[PDB]
């Protein structure tokens, strides 16, 4: 029944405590250890060039003002006690919109230690910007980072380090992206200098490899089928003007619709993507097929057989070059 | 171990401090220096005529009530101390929706100085309205501004200036817009008079040049290909009524679909854009091509050869005039 004794101990710690002053104010910088437990990566958006990350953000630092004696236990206090304690001004530099879950209470943990060590945990869902190079899309590889920095305190007042070395960030295997796979993750600690001063920086980066399975069925297969569809006109007799012309028109129009649909699902980038090159190549073959019959119709008022062997061969050669270049 | 001495010094500063009164109340106006560190420009929306801006907003001013002696250091206090200090009522006049990031704490910095100088920094994501002239779209150039003004205090009570002159705003090179490029940025300081009084105004303006690479592939190229597609009917024999008529219909219908799709991605402006003029011109050529065969069919129940040389030549002339006018 030492709850009163614990209450007296905690009240003594908070008596005269100044939240406005960091631990060891005016002296050596306070070292803050950080570990991240990744819950999931909900979305990866190419149009907005950002990803949504949910994680458990733990911060580890020692505050001698909170040291207590006579209690051989780690005091796990209510999350509302964090308002009366100094906490690092940690923020994410590249985030676009973040929040802390508050159901049924704020997703916050405070755990004191006899030596003054403070454990501060937060469950944060953050949307962090990630610039993407879509030149090799959809066969591209992306590197999305999460920048962690102190906002007000410089390196003279605070220092950041990954607690546990390369094992600071866990839960990477929990990431289940339908479109991407986590090839590798890295931890970087460095100092970044601004006009106000030099600030400690922690960076967490993931290398994402896009899955080609969806795009083969969605885009590449329909484009090939339309190109094969245009080859049917070669076997049709030249006197069937309505049939062969209709086949050329529909394949060309269908190719345009596929190309327009793809570009509407991606940001309006000026450079040409890998998928755009394939669609442009497919459009050339179907357009040449319709031009081939126009040449046949013009001379008539052997050529078809020559077209039956060149177009499938050239298209196969085009596919071989395209896939080798981008793989 | 002078934390108690610092605590006594800070408590003395805030004892009797009145947040309701500006520094030097009833006397000379307080000069506020402002610097902006641009983080990124996330979006530029033509439909909503606004852009999203993330930046570090720093305010510099001197408050003699906060001057302290005996501490040869700059007191970097917790961000929660800003609630007990007077801050300028700075607001953005042209913003539509703005907020201050609050993860893991509010993105706010307070840094006092021995002479009473106060540094106040905020990380703000703002959506500022920007009226756009789309007459030359997509070859247009846009000038988006960010208006900074005091809400309650007039020029007799507060003054704004860019701290550092033309170097007040940094991070412009960090802006990576896929559709726009930052040609130039300007800093303007002026006074704006309302009924309540004259107020200090700071303006930050960017000149944006749109990238034509996306629109060439998305819109201009399909329009040209459809126009070339209509020219195939000239080489088709006139007796193939079904083939030539089908060619004319499909090109006309496809041109309409392209025109409708483009206008759905832009605000419902009454004036004609540059891209609209090109689409209207392309529609004329394909419509005339179908009318050309109707004339040929009518006279039959030489003209085709004359059409084979006029339409490509006129279309090339139309393209030359169009591009020279808008470049």
């Amino acid at each position, epitope marked *: 029944g030492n709850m009163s004794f614990v209450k007296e101990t905690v009240d003594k710690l908070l008596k005269g405590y100044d939240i406005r002053l960091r631990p060891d104010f005016g002296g050596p910088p306070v070292c803050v250890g950080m570990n991240i437990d990744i819950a999931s990566i909900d979305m990866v958006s190419e149009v907005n060039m950002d990803y949504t990350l949910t994680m458990y953000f733990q911060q580890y630092w020692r505050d001698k003002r909170l040291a207590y004696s006579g209690i051989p236990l780690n005091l796990t206090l209510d999350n509302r006690v964090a308002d009366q304690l100094w906490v690092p001004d940690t923020y994410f530099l590249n985030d676009k919109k973040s929040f802390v879950h508050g159901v049924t209470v704020k997703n916050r943990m405070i755990r004191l230690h006899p030596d003054g060590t403070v454990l501060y945990g937060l469950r944060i869902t953050t949307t962090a910007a990630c610039m993407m*190079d879509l030149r090799r899309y959809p066969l591209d590889e992306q590197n999305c980072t999460l920048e962690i920095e102190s906002y007000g305190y410089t390196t003279d007042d605070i220092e950041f380090y990954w607690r546990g070395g390369d094992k600071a960030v866990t839960g990477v295997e929990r990431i289940e992206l339908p479109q991407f796979s986590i090839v590798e993750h890295r931890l970087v600690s460095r100092n970044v200098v601004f006009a106000t001063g030099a600030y400690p920086r922690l960076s967490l980066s993931f290398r994402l490899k896009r899955n080609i399975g969806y795009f083969i069925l969605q885009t590449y297969m329909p484009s090939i089928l339309i190109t094969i569809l245009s080859w049917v006109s070669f076997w049709i007799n030249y006197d069937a003007s309505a049939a062969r012309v209709a086949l050329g028109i529909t394949t060309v129009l269908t190719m345009t619709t596929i190309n327009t649909h793809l570009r509407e699902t991606l940001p309006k980038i000026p450079y040409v993507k890998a998928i755009d090159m394939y669609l442009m190549g497919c459009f050339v073959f179907v357009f040449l097929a319709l031009l081939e019959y126009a040449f046949v119709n013009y001379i008539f008022f052997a050529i078809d057989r020559w077209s039956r062997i060149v177009f499938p061969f050239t298209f196969s050669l085009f596919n071989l070059v395209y896939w080798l270049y981008y793989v | 171990g002078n934390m108690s001495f610092v605590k006594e010094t800070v408590d003395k500063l805030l004892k009797g401090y009145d947040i309701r009164l500006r520094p030097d109340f009833g006397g000379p106006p307080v000069c506020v220096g402002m610097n902006i560190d641009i983080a990124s420009i996330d979006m530029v929306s033509e439909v909503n005529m606004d852009y999203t801006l993330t930046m570090y907003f720093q305010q510099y001013w001197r408050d003699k009530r906060l001057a302290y002696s005996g501490i040869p250091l700059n007191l970097t206090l917790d961000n929660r101390v800003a609630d007990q200090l007077w801050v300028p009522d700075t607001y953005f006049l042209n913003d539509k929706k703005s907020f201050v990031h609050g993860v893991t704490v509010k993105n706010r910095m307070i840094r006092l100085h021995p002479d009473g100088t106060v540094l106040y920094g905020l990380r703000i994501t703002t959506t500022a309205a920007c009226m756009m002239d789309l007459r030359r779209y997509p070859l247009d150039e846009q000038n988006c501004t960010l208006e900074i003004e005091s809400y309650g205090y007039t020029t007799d009570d507060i003054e704004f200036y860019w701290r550092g002159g033309d170097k007040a705003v940094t991070g412009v*090179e960090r802006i990576e817009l896929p559709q726009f490029s930052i040609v130039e940025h300007r800093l303007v300081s002026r006074n704006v008079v309302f009924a309540t009084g004259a107020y200090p105004r700071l303006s930050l303006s960017f000149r944006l040049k749109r990238n034509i690479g996306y629109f060439i592939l998305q819109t201009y190229m399909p329009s040209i290909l459809i126009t070339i597609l209509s020219w195939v009917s000239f080489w088709i024999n006139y007796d193939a009524s079904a083939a030539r008529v089908a060619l004319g219909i499909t090109t006309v219908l496809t041109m309409t679909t392209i025109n409708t799709h483009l206008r759905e991605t832009l605000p419902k402006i009454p004036y004609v854009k540059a891209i609209d003029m090109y689409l209207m011109g392309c529609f004329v050529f394909v419509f005339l091509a179908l009318l050309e065969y109707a004339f040929v069919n009518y006279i039959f129940f030489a003209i085709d050869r004359w059409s084979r040389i006029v339409f490509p030549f006129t279309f090339s002339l139309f393209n030359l005039v169009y591009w020279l006018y808008y470049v």
Partner: nanobody
Amino acid sequence: QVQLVESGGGLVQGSLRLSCAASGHTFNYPIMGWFRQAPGKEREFVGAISWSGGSTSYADSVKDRFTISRDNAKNTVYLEMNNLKPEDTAVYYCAAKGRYSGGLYYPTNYDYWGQGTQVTV
């Protein structure tokens, strides 16, 4: 991983054009900077430019005298030094900066550096 090679120095009494070729993961480092280090003096920022958009910044000393531009076809950033002065005698370096590495003017924010060319007038 970005490799930087610079050339085009020499000794002159004039107009000179430095150049810097980049190779590797240039997308992760879209900002290229130019630095010079006088003997005994600390390394000095000259100018910076982005790979995309061509936005550029310059120091006051070299303002209106040095022009910086790049071509993405060759992945080359070139510094054009016109109206040279005796104060412009230092080893010119080429550097690349990360997307979230901070200010341009501070050399410590740059990760990859070139060999450096000595220019004396």
